[PDB]
Amino acid sequence: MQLSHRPAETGDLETVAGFPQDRDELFYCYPKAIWPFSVAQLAAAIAERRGSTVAVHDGQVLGFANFYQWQHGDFCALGNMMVAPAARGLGVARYLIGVMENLAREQYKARLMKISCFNANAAGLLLYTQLGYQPRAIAERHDPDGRRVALIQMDKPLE
Numbered sequence: 001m002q003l004s005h006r007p008a009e010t011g012d013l014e015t016v017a018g019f020p021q022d023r024d025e026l027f028y029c030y031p032k033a034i035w036p037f038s039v040a041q042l043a044a045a046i047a048e049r050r051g052s053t054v055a056v057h058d059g060q061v062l063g064f065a066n067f068y069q070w071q072h073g074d075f076c077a078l079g080n081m082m083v084a085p086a087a088r089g090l091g092v093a094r095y096l097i098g099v100m101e102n103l104a105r106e107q108y109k110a111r112l113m114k115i116s117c118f119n120a121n122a123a124g125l126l127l128y129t130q131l132g133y134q135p136r137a138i139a140e141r142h143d144p145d146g147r148r149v150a151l152i153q154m155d156k157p158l159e
């Protein structure tokens, strides 16, 4: 992958909003969203968040992420991590996580990145582990069906 990145733009929203393929994928990346996902839901997140970034390869937006929490000199928390269904497992998430780590360090002076990952998302848990994130706590949350899920709260120092 020759990958690049830039801030998210209005024109990207329809593409990015197409990434979650089912209600599980949507919950894992945006638990407050309601299925079906929409550009309006995506735009609302962007508005209340920081750092919304896309990853681009060969003219295609393949990934998106942002911060749902940010505390200058302290940390950021990565949110809305979405990857195009045709580009899963190819390094887009790894790439964007690296981008977001740099952004947290440089723009927020963060010492730590937090990532919270739902228990059912094994692929996320494994990736973040491979990227040097360590599990710190488990919180109870509830899915759209009112079922109890475990949110695994991980972090990583940035340097």
Ligand SMILES: CC(=O)OCC1=C(C(=O)O)N2C(=O)[C@@H](NC(=O)Cc3cccs3)[C@H]2SC1
Pocket: 028, 029, 030, 031, 032, 068, 078, 079, 080, 081, 082, 115, 116, 117, 118, 141, 142, 143, 151
């Ligand atoms: C890496 C990634 O994509 O994380 C998605 C996520 C988000 C998100 O929306 O970006 N999060 C938030 O905004 C947090 N939300 C909660 O802990 C509240 C919840 C209520 C019901 C279930 S979780 C975390 S819960 C995890």
